[PDB]
């Protein structure tokens, strides 16, 4: 399941997320949310959870960047004013 | 950077962590801490945190085993009374 | 079909559900489970599903409340430690 969120960067000054990079002997795993801090715009929405994969932010698609470039772009965008839209793929299960 | 830990399950009913696994088909993943609920054993200890990678519990050693078996081991150990001692690798920066 | 599931918040940080409210022109249709987080207590029990309707929490009936007041109650109760009982209607 894919989900799309909008964060109001008016009230909040930061997302409150850690970003964990999966890399392997291929290293293209992607980037995921590790934890979420109370106090930020993500916790206030409720939707995202640790382990969610981050696919795209405002438009930029991260599915084929390197982990280090997708974060370089996330950093620059939270570093500017304006609403931040995120879309993520949510964690799965079954063993 | 590892670190190990004993959890007197005597004040608690469970560890307070969920687990997540990376396929290590032939990709040696293993299982990581996903999140830590408050007031469970791991939180009181506060020394373990999201994505530390889980290496052994109570004498058994998770490195060469499939994710499922690891997980099975952990739940059995969790269900029996007794300290419980985890040893887990710290997510790297 | 109306089920009653009981959940342990000891074992989890959240119920893991989003809540979606319908309203008519008059007023309210009620509140429903819009999506399920794995990860939470609800998916861990497996019995409720997306589209189900939430009738009562913990002996408190939402049957004539407004959407908003019922979501207040619901939040007020979740925020407390303890087991949580949900009564919900299966989507046919």
């Amino acid at each position: 399941m894919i989900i799309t969120v909008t964060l109001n960067m008016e009230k909040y000054n930061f997302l409150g997320i850690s970003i964990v990079g999966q890399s392997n002997e291929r290293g293209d795993g992607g980037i995921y949310i590790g934890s979420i801090m109370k106090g930020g715009a993500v916790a206030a929405d409720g939707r995202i959870e640790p382990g969610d994969m981050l696919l795209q932010v405002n438009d930029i698609n991260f599915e084929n960047m390197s982990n280090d470039d997708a974060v370089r772009v996330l950093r620059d965008i939270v570093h500017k004013p304006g609403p931040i839209v995120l879309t993520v793929a949510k964690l799965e299960h079954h063993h | 950077m590892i670190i190990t830990v004993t959890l007197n399950m005597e004040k608690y009913n469970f560890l307070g962590i969920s687990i997540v696994g990376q396929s290590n088909e032939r990709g040696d993943g293993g299982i990581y801490i996903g999140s830590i609920m408050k007031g469970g054993a791991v939180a009181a200890d506060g020394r373990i945190e999201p994505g530390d990678m889980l290496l052994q519990v109570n004498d058994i050693n998770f490195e060469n085993m499939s994710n499922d078996d690891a997980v099975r081991v952990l739940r059995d150990i969790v269900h029996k009374p007794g300290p419980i001692v985890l040893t887990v690798a710290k997510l790297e920066h | 079909m109306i089920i009653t599931v009981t959940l342990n918040m000891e074992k989890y940080n959240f119920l893991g559900i989003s809540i979606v409210g319908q309203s008519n022109e008059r007023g309210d249709g009620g509140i429903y489970i819009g999506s399920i987080m794995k990860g939470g207590a609800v998916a861990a029990d497996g019995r409720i599903e997306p589209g189900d309707m939430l009738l009562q929490v913990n002996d408190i009936n939402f049957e004539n409340m407004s959407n908003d007041d019922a979501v207040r109650v619901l939040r007020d109760i979740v925020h407390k430690p303890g087991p949580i009982v949900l009564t919900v209607a299966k989507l046919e």
Binding site: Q22, G29, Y32, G51, M53, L91, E92, H93, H94, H95 | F14, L15, I17, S18, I19, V20, G21, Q22, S23, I31, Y32, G34, M37, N67, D68, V71, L74, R75, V78 | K11, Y12, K38, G39, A44
Partner: peptide
């Protein structure tokens, strides 16, 4: 890929 396995 990561997947949820259980909470304990």
């Amino acid at each position: 890929s990561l997947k949820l396995m259980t909470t304990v």
